[PDB]
Ligand binder design. Structure first.
Ligand SMILES: *[C@@H]1O[C@H](CO[C@@H]2O[C@@H](C)[C@@H](O)[C@@H](O)[C@@H]2O)[C@@H](O[C@@H]2O[C@H](CO)[C@@H](O[C@@H]3O[C@H](CO[C@H]4O[C@H](CO)[C@@H](O)[C@H](O)[C@@H]4O)[C@@H](O)[C@H](O[C@H]4O[C@H](CO)[C@@H](O)[C@H](O)[C@@H]4O)[C@@H]3O)[C@H](O)[C@H]2NC(C)=O)[C@H](O)[C@H]1NC(C)=O
Ligand code: HEC
Ligand code: UF7
Ligand SMILES: *[C@@H]1O[C@H](CO)[C@@H](O[C@@H]2O[C@H](CO)[C@@H](O)[C@H](O)[C@H]2NC(C)=O)[C@H](O)[C@H]1NC(C)=O
Ligand code: CA
Ligand code: CL
Ligand code: CL
Lengths: 464, 104
């Protein structure tokens, strides 16, 4: 039992406690850890590999589901509208909310022991981990039902299955557009963006669209951008009473904060108006995730960065220099060599002290230790892993929005005018949203505009 | 595997017609490099006490977190060029691509 025990017996791989730990004084304790399920349970022939339970595609699978029985249970089957299920108990000031999930040991009930607020049900099981993730999901569910409602007025002869799929195909395309046109250039920086994501030529059925094992750990770089608080704002973008600067350790699994505290509106306002944490080689991750991850829902608080490293070991991922060689980058051997690569000898002496050799540095630790690429938020090694992965997802997606046959020329010309701020404009009571790029705009009122300046998606090109 | 289709399957099955499961859910990850396990095929490095990795003892993940990651939350530097939305879109996007199950 890995939830409560410290014994290293399969499938448990607990994190042992070092001497003079800042938070954990009891050395007989541990940080709980379940080894990832193997693809081939109990085999002496195959080299242990792990499973991806989701579609690798950027197909909005976190909204619709990656398995047929969950997918049907996410839809409204009582009518022929093509809608996706809405919470039959609560509404965000009239607007739709995610439906609740039937869980045996519900962790969301443990956040406010008297609120009687369960987890939300969505295409991906992690919907209630943080109210900010719940708000993003809640925003996309409304967008699908908005699209399936405007498609019913343009094409009344259409059915429920014809409305669900057509709305699905719009939502998916929007996720790809926001991801590739606005998100990725800001992660890789212009040079790596050009190197790894050259302008789309067309879908190629020889490009493997799977998620590589390493990407599951490498994309965890996002942990360096995590701010220690959930920032909530009012109509005029001011700290909203109650709880305007709530710690992250008090919001994990706290779905009651959406249902009882202003809904998704003050949460979404603040993802736009507050700046993200910047990664610095002396400020890698906040102690709300490094010391109090899931504090009030389990026996002990977890250390997300340590889990990232234990997970890379569990997944048998090669070390830092092995990945540097894979990306075509040089592999340092000495502390002086590592100091030059990192452009920081203070950090190289530190990494050498633990690992002994740059060959042993865990892919996540080495990844986030590199200096950030110009106008980017990842170093050269991570820019390669993340870049290569996203290129395979794009070029190997038969239903990639830009590919011939997927959409009409006119539908593509319409889809191009979509933006995340305009989706907020349509699915919320938020009157003033971010000026594009939404991921760069972080200052109020300098980077903020009204709803009437952003044009909405014209679905005229979709009618029959 | 149908000959003509207008929409994606829920599972991703049939997106690549030559290898129908590529990209589909509940399938093993691809590997860009071979795995490095303590016993060559399953035990993770740091499993057996005393067993070195590449000639050096294995550092405890929590010790690495403590000596390299830990910082005073008072000293947080805010990214003057990105919003908290940039962070949130990343986790949402991550939840479209991958989930690695464990037992219970
Ligand atoms: C459709 O996509 C295919 C995959 O594309 C890859 O992924 C995308 C996302 C991009 O990043 C793209 O740049 C990637 O290539 C793509 O097919 C690929 O095409 C190249 C060139 O045709 C192939 O590389 C050649 O491979 C042979 C065999 O060796 C390879 O595999 C072994 C085993 O893993 C490795 O040890 C090697 O490192 C190789 O990777 C090589 O012999 C060959 O190089 C030799 O020849 C050239 C000159 O002729 C010299 O420069 C070299 O020094 C060598 O002497 C190439 O390396 C690649 O294998 C192939 N992959 C697949 C899946 O078929 C395809 O071209 C795309 N089509 C279009 C129109 O876009
Ligand atoms: C942009 C990237 C990104 C962001 C932001 C992000 N994560 Fe992660 N996180 C990941 C990825 C990718 C993984 C691996 C997912 C998988 O395959 O199971 C991960 C895994 C995790 C895990 C499982 C770790 C383990 O080894 O057991 C936890 C817990 C986690 N993240 C929590 C969070 C929380 C809490 C937040 C904030 C609300 C967050 N993450 C934000 C990318 C991110
Ligand atoms: N691959 C991952 C995994 C998680 C965690 C997994 C951590 N263990 C959770 C599982 C949780 C639980 C139990 C029963 C019923 C529902 C949820 C439990 C209870 C108490 C302590 C810990 C846990 C996660 C997984 C699924 C939903 C929410 C969070 C992530 N969260 N964001 N991104 C993530 N990526
Ligand atoms: C759990 O949620 C409830 C909401 O139902 C919170 O209760 C409110 O708290 C404020 C401030 O303490 C009171 O003035 C209100 O009268 C309470 N309302 C209700 C309906 O009880 C409660 O504080 C939350 N619990 C925790 C631990 O934060
Ligand atoms: Ca998906
Ligand atoms: Cl319900
Ligand atoms: Cl890999």
């Amino acid at each position: 039992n890995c939830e409560t025990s410290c014994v290293q017996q399969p499938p448990c791989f607990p994190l042992k406690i070092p001497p003079n730990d800042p938070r954990i004084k009891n050395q007989a304790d541990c940080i709980p850890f379940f080894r990832s399920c193997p693809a081939c349970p109990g085999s002496n022939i195959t080299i242990r590999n792990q499973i991806n339970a989701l579609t690798s595609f950027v197909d909005a699978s976190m909204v619709y589901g990656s398995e047929e029985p969950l997918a049907r249970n996410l839809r409204n089957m009582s009518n022929q509208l093509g809608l996706l299920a809405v919470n039959q108990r609560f509404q965000d000031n009239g607007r739709a909310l995610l439906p609740f999930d039937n869980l045996h040991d519900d962790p969301c009930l443990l956040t406010n022991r008297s609120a009687r607020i369960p987890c939300f049900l969505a295409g991906d099981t992690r919907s209630s981990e943080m109210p900010e993730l719940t708000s993003m999901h809640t925003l996309l569910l409304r967008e699908h039902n908005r699209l399936a409602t405007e498609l019913k007025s343009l094409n009344p002869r259409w059915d429920g299955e014809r409305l669900y799929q057509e709305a699905r195909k719009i939502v998916g395309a929007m996720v790809q557009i926001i991801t590739y046109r606005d998100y990725l250039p800001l992660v890789l920086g212009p040079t790596a963006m050009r190197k790894y994501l050259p302008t789309y030529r067309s879908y190629n059925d020889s490009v493997d669209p799977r998620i590589a094992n390493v990407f599951t750990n490498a994309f965890r770089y996002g942990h360096t951008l995590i701010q220690p608080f959930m920032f909530r704002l009012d109509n005029r973008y001011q700290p909203m009473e109650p709880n305007p600067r709530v710690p992250l350790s008090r919001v994990f699994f706290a779905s009651w904060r959406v249902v009882l505290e202003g809904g998704i509106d003050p949460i979404l306002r603040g993802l736009m108006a507050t700046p993200a944490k910047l990664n610095r080689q002396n400020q890698i991750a906040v102690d709300e995730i490094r010391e109090r991850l899931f504090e009030q829902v389990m026996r002990i608080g977890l250390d997300l960065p340590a889990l990232n490293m234990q997970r890379s070991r569990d997944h048998g991922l090669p070390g830092y220099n092995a990945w540097r060689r894979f990306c075509g980058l040089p592999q340092p051997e000495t502390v002086g060599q590592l100091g030059t690569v990192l452009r920081n000898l203070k950090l190289a002496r530190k990494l050498m002290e633990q690992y002994g050799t740059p060959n042993n540095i865990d892919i996540w630790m080495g990844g986030v230790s590199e200096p950030l690429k110009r106008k980017g938020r990842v170093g050269p090694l991570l820019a390669c892993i993340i870049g290569t992965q996203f290129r395979k997802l794009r070029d190997g997606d038969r239903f990639w929005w830009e590919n011939e046959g997927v959409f009409s020329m006119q539908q593509r010309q319409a889809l191009a005018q979509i933006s995340l701020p305009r989706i907020i404009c349509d699915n919320t009571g938020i009157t003033t949203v971010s000026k594009n790029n939404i991921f760069m705009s972080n200052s109020y009122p300098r980077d903020f505009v009204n709803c009437s300046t952003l044009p909405a998606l014209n679905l005229a090109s979709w009618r029959e | 595997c149908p000959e003509q289709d207008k929409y994606r399957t829920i599972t991703g099955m049939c997106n690549n017609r030559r290898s129908p499961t590529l990209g589909a859910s509940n399938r093993a990850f691809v590997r860009w490099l071979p795995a490095e396990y303590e016993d060559g095929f399953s035990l993770p490095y740091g499993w057996t006490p005393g067993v070195k990795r590449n000639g050096f003892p294995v550092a405890l993940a929590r010790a690495v977190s403590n000596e390299i990651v830990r910082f005073p939350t008072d000293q947080l530097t805010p990214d003057q060029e990105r919003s908290l939305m940039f962070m949130q879109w990343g986790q949402l996007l991550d939840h479209d691509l991958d989930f690695t199950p464990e037992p219970a």
